Amino acid sequence: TTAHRPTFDPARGKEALRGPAYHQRLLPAYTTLKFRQPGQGGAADKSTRDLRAELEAAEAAHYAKLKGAPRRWDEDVVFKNQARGTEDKGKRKEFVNDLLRSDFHKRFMSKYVR
Amino acid sequence: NKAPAPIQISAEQLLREAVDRQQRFADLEEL
Amino acid sequence: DVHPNNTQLWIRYIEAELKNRNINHARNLLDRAVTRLPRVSKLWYKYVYVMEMLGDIPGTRQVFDRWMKWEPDEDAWNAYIKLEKRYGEYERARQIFA
Amino acid sequence: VKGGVWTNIEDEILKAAVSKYGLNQWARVSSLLARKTPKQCKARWNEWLDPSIKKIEWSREEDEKLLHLAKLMPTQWRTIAPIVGRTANQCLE
Amino acid sequence: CDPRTNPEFWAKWEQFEVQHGNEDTFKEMLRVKRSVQAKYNTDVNFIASQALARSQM
Amino acid sequence: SLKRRREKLAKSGEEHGDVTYINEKNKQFNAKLARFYNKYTAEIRDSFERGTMV
Amino acid sequence: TKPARPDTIDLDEDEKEMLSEARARLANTQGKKAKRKARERQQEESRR
Amino acid sequence: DMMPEGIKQSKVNTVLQHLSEAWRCWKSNIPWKVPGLPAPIENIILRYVKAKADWWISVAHYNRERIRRGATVDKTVAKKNVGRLTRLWLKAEQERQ
Amino acid sequence: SPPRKLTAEDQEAWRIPPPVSMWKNPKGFTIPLDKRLAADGRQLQEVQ
Amino acid sequence: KRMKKKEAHRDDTAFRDYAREAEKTYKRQIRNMGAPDLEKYMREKLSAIEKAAAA
Amino acid sequence: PEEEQGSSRNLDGRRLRTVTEAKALAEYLAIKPEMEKREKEARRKRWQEIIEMTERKQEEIRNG
Amino acid sequence: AALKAGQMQKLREAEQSSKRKPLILPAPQVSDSELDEIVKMGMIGERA
RNA sequence: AGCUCUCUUUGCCUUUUGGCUUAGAUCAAGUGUAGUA
Numbered sequence: 136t137t138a139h140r141p142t143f144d145p146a147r148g149k150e151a152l153r154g155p156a157y158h159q160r161l162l163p164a165y166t167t168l169k170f171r172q173p174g175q176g177g178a179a180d181k182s183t184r185d186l187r188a189e190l191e192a193a194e195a196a197h198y199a200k201l202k203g204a205p206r207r208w209d210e211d212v213v214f215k216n217q218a219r220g221t222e223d224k225g226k227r228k229e230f231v232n233d234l235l236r237s238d239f240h241k242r243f244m245s246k247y248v249r
Numbered sequence: 250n251k252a253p254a255p256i257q258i259s260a261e262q263l264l265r266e267a268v269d270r271q272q273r274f275a276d277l278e279e280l
Numbered sequence: 281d282v283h284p285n286n287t288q289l290w291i292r293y294i295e296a297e298l299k300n301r302n303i304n305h306a307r308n309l310l311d312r313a314v315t316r317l318p319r320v321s322k323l324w325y326k327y328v329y330v331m332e333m334l335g336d337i338p339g340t341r342q343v344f345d346r347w348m349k350w351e352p353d354e355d356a357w358n359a360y361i362k363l364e365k366r367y368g369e370y371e372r373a374r375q376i377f378a
Numbered sequence: 379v380k381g382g383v384w385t386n387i388e389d390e391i392l393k394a395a396v397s398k399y400g401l402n403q404w405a406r407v408s409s410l411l412a413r414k415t416p417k418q419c420k421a422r423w424n425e426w427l428d429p430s431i432k433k434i435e436w437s438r439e440e441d442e443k444l445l446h447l448a449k450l451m452p453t454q455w456r457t458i459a460p461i462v463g464r465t466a467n468q469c470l471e
Numbered sequence: 472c473d474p475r476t477n478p479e480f481w482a483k484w485e486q487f488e489v490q491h492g493n494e495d496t497f498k499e500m501l502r503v504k505r506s507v508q509a510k511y512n513t514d515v516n517f518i519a520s521q522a523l524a525r526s527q528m
Numbered sequence: 529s530l531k532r533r534r535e536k537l538a539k540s541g542e543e544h545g546d547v548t549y550i551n552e553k554n555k556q557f558n559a560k561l562a563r564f565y566n567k568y569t570a571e572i573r574d575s576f577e578r579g580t581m582v
Numbered sequence: 583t584k585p586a587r588p589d590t591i592d593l594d595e596d597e598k599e600m601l602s603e604a605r606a607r608l609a610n611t612q613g614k615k616a617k618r619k620a621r622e623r624q625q626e627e628s629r630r
Numbered sequence: 631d632m633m634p635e636g637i638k639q640s641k642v643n644t645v646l647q648h649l650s651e652a653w654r655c656w657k658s659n660i661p662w663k664v665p666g667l668p669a670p671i672e673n674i675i676l677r678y679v680k681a682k683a684d685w686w687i688s689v690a691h692y693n694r695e696r697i698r699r700g701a702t703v704d705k706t707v708a709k710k711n712v713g714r715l716t717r718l719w720l721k722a723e724q725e726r727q
Numbered sequence: 728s729p730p731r732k733l734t735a736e737d738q739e740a741w742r743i744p745p746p747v748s749m750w751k752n753p754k755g756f757t758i759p760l761d762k763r764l765a766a767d768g769r770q771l772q773e774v775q
Numbered sequence: 776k777r778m779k780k781k782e783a784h785r786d787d788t789a790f791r792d793y794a795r796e797a798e799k800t801y802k803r804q805i806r807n808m809g810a811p812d813l814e815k816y817m818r819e820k821l822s823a824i825e826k827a828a829a830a
Numbered sequence: 831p832e833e834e835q836g837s838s839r840n841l842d843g844r845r846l847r848t849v850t851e852a853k854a855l856a857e858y859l860a861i862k863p864e865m866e867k868r869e870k871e872a873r874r875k876r877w878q879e880i881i882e883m884t885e886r887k888q889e890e891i892r893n894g
Numbered sequence: 895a896a897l898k899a900g901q902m903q904k905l906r907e908a909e910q911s912s913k914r915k916p917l918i919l920p921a922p923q924v925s926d927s928e929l930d931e932i933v934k935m936g937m938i939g940e941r942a
Numbered sequence: 943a944g945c946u947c948u949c950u951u952u953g954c955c956u957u958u959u960g961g962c963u964u965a966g967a968u969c970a971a972g973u974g975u976a977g978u979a
Contacts, residue, residue: 136612136613136615136616136753137753137960138615139960139961139962140960140961141643141646141960141961141962142960142961143643143960234683234684234687234688235683235687235718235721235722239691240687240718243691243694244715244718244719244722247694247698247715248715248719250590250591250592251590251591252590252591253588253589253590253591253841254588254589254590254591255840255841256835256838256839256840256846257386257588257589257838257839257840257841258386258387258390258589258601258838258839259390259837259838259839259845260390260391260393260394260397261546261547261548261837262390262835262837262838263390263391263394263601263604263605263608264394264397264546264547264548264549264550264608264757265547265837266605267550267605267608267609268547268549268550268551268609270605270609271550271551271609287793319728319729319730320793321730321793321794321797321798322793322794322796322797322800325797325798325800325801328801329801329804329805332805332808333808337816337819352729353729353794355794355798359798359801359802359805362805366811367811367813367816368813368816380970380971383584383587384584384586384587385586385587385588385589385597386586386587386588386589387589387593387597387600387601388586389586391600391601391604393760394604394608394757395604395608396760396763397548397757397758397759397760397763398608398752398755398756398757398758399752400748400749400750400752400763401749401763402749402750402965403750403965405968405969409607409969410600410603410604410607411600412596412599412600413596425583426583426584426585429572429575429576429582429760429764430575430581430582430770431580431581432580432581433579433580433581434506434509434580434581435505435506435509437502437506438499438502460774461774461775465583467583468583471583509578509580510578512578512579512843513574513577513578514577514844514845514848515577515899515902515903515906517844517848517852518848518851518852518855518899519903521849521852521853521855521856522852522855522856522859523859524856525853525856525857525859525860526856526859526860532956533956536954536955536956544898545847546837546847547837548757548758548759549756549757550608550609550611550755550756550757551611552957553754553756553957553958553959554754554756554757554958554959555958556955556956556957556958557745557756557958557959558756558757558758558759558762558958559955559958560745560955560958561745561747561758561759561762561958562759562762563955564666564742564744564745565665565666565744565745565761565762565765566905568665568666568765569761569762569764569765570909572760572761572764572765573761576760576761579843588841608757610755611754611755611756612755633741634731634733634737634741635730635731635733636730636731636733636792636793636794637733637737637738637741638738638790640955641743641955641958642743643960644743644744644745644746644959645743646960646961647746647748647959647960648743648744648746650748650751650961650962651746651748651749651750651751651766654748654749654750654965655749657965658965660749660767660768660769661768661769661772662766662768663766663768664744664746664766665744665765665766666742666744667743667744668740668741668742668743671743706963706964708964709964709967710963710964711964712964713963713964714964716964717964730792730794731792732791732792732794733791733792734791735789735790735791735953738789738790738791745958745959746959747959748959749965750965751959752959753959753960754959755959756959758959777943785952788952788953788954789952789953789954790953790954851895851898851899854895854896855895855896855899858895858896862896897950
């Protein structure tokens with residue numbers, strides 16, 4: 136059947152109706168605009184090269200901060216030392232762009248599907 | 250007679266059989 | 281209105297008014313069509329062909345002049361030259377090669 | 379009766395039903411057939427009627443592969459069957 | 472090659488096998504003949520086979 | 529153009545080979561499918577025409 | 583896993599019935615509303 | 631926007647049907663590779679099937695947390711969520727095999 | 728700007744295959760089983 | 776010239792774009808129009824001489 | 831009756847349309863060379879009929 | 895029927911130019927250096 | 943070396959599948975006899 140259909144021509148916006156007002160639609164709320172006070176920044180433009188210098192100084196400061204520069208009881212046991220290198224996970228937390236193979240999905244699906 | 254038939258049906262025979270069994274104006278007012 | 285730049289619709293409306301001998305109507309349509317869609321070669325071809333089949337060789341020349349104003353592809357200049365070679369004004373075809 | 383062996387009528391009706399409904403609606407296909415369930419129709423397509431199934435006599439190369447794999451993976455026939463190139467019942471028999 | 476349309480080539484292969492071959496290679500040639508004959512059992516190849524069979528008579 | 533339309537209708541009205549459709553839209557779609565996909569599904573086609581391996 | 587048994591000379595009532603149903607359901611394309619709208623179109627033409 | 635100029639654009643909702651089938655093949659872990667579908671169109675379809683899939687998986691994670699906590703009482707949410715995690719488990723298990 | 732000079736190679740390069748669904752059939756079509764099994768990559772997958 | 780023309784016609788039957796089909800259709804229509812009546816054209820041109828030298 | 835149900839199969843696995851086409855094509859391969867003969871002599875005799883008509887007209891114009 | 899089969903065999907011939915598994919010839923048990931050895935030994939014999 | 947008609951091949955696709963989700967969900971079924979006439 137073709138009762139159930141896609142959209143190939145989505146609905147188009149209309150201008151407002153130029154009619155007499157009787158209907159109530161939007162109750163007033165937050166009718167006062169806040170402005171950036173002195174100290175809240177924004178209302179001060181200095182130049183371009185000063186901004187570039189400040190940006191590069193902040194980047195150099197962050198890189199400086201990151202760098203830091205100013206009978207034995209276990210002898211009949213069949214297998215010994217099976218857990219070397221297992222605790223070494225956590226060298227650097229790494230992002231994989233696959234939500235089916237990310238570590239979050241594996242943790243989630245091992246927690247829940249028991 | 251449970252001997253095998255000389256002709257055996259195919260699905261295209263089913264599809265073929267499915268296919269096989271599938272004003273004057275007097276005045277201006279009628280126009 | 282719904283499909284302004286559709287060449288098939290334009291040709292259908294022009295031919296629907298040409299089959300009923302509404303020549304002035306269809307020439308208005310063709311001017312509007314090649315005004316709306318100046319880089320569609322089919323509309324220009326249809327306008328030059330309609331003007332040549334009606335016997336108005338100066339009309340065909342003025343339509344070709346507007347098209348050449350629009351700087352078309354090679355086939356349009358070739359068609360204009362073949363027109364002037366068909367009718368024998370070889371100096372005019374020389375100007376068109378210039 | 380909801381059982382039996384597959385006849386030619388049922389195989390042709392199954393193939394036409396699969397042509398109309400596809401390989402993911404076995405309940406419609408099984409509604410066409412009076413004696414067969416959706417699982418039996420699915421098993422008949424997967425084990426017999428699939429056009430990737432080789433019904434010719436075996437080669438010696440396939441025999442060598444089959445015996446080699448049956449020695450590798452004992453009684454793991456559904457594992458061996460994709461590697462050999464036939465179905466599991468074909469390799470078993 | 473088709474066995475039921477090109478029999479002379481298979482006759483030449485059997486002649487080469489009886490001059491140079493064994494029972495194992497002969498069984499291999501039977502196996503290849505049966506496999507190829509089974510492969511060419513299409514409708515169009517059956518039509519061609521019957522067409523040439525009634526054409527040579 | 530009307531003669532071309534009638535000739536196309538008459539040519540497609542003639543059937544040749546097996547019937548794999550149930551109405552005329554299905555026949556047109558199946559012929560379009562053939563025109564695009566025969567060059568990719570030859571082996572499956574002969575698997576049906578043969579009764580065995582691809 | 584066995585090849586299909588060939589068809590007998592005389593088929594059962596089960597077999598002939600399932601062939602009749604197979605033809606009927608193979609020829610089918612429409613749901614309820616489409617069939618009803620086609621029947622309504624024919625009926626409205628008859629009434630007109 | 632990625633079709634060239636002058637190509638006959640008569641059949642382009644066909645791509646949307648391809649996207650629908652590609653999504654269904656993603657859910658059922660069936661590989662999707664249409665013979666003869668161009669690489670640009672295939673790239674668009676694969677890109678948006680990845681995006682839809684990520685939205686699906688995130689919604690499954692969120693509803694599973696809410697079902698664990700008892701924050702929801704609707705039966706439809708639980709049924710949808712068990713269906714999604716059944717599919718996700720079977721995808722992971724096919725990968726494991 | 729003047730229209731792009733296409734070739735028949737480009738027109739063939741932008742042909743969109745007719746889609747054959749493994750799940751859907753809103754017109755109740757009977758599709759050949761060759762075309763239904765055309766986009767199933769599972770048979771053409773590798774095993775090793 | 777005729778054989779090169781017909782090889783060009785054979786090679787230009789697959790669709791490239793609508794500009795080329797417009798070109799082909801126009802050339803076919805002009806060819807099917809026939810050779811022009813140049814005597815009628817010369818008569819009309821002479822009448823245009825006499826009218827344009829009357830205005 | 832085999833025209834209507836010609837898409838069914840035999841016991842071996844051959845379609846009735848296939849064997850009917852095979853028989854018809856075998857007959858055509860038997861009969862095709864003699865048809866291309868009889869058409870070549872047919873057009874040949876038509877050509878001599880033309881040459882006889884034109885020798886008749888030229889002798890009619892030469893004798894008056 | 896003949897013309898339809900002619901079209902079918904044209905398509906079969908189109909298939910026939912692509913299904914060719916290439917002839918993987920075995921390595922010969924003798925190499926061309928030993929062939930040249932046989933050539934010059936036979937030349938020595940015939941010259942003697 | 944033309945123009946008509948006819949046929950073939952090439953082009954063309956021209957009635958040529960119009961969304962979604964937990965494949966949206968689910969799906970066993972009346973009775974079939976009959977020593978003797």
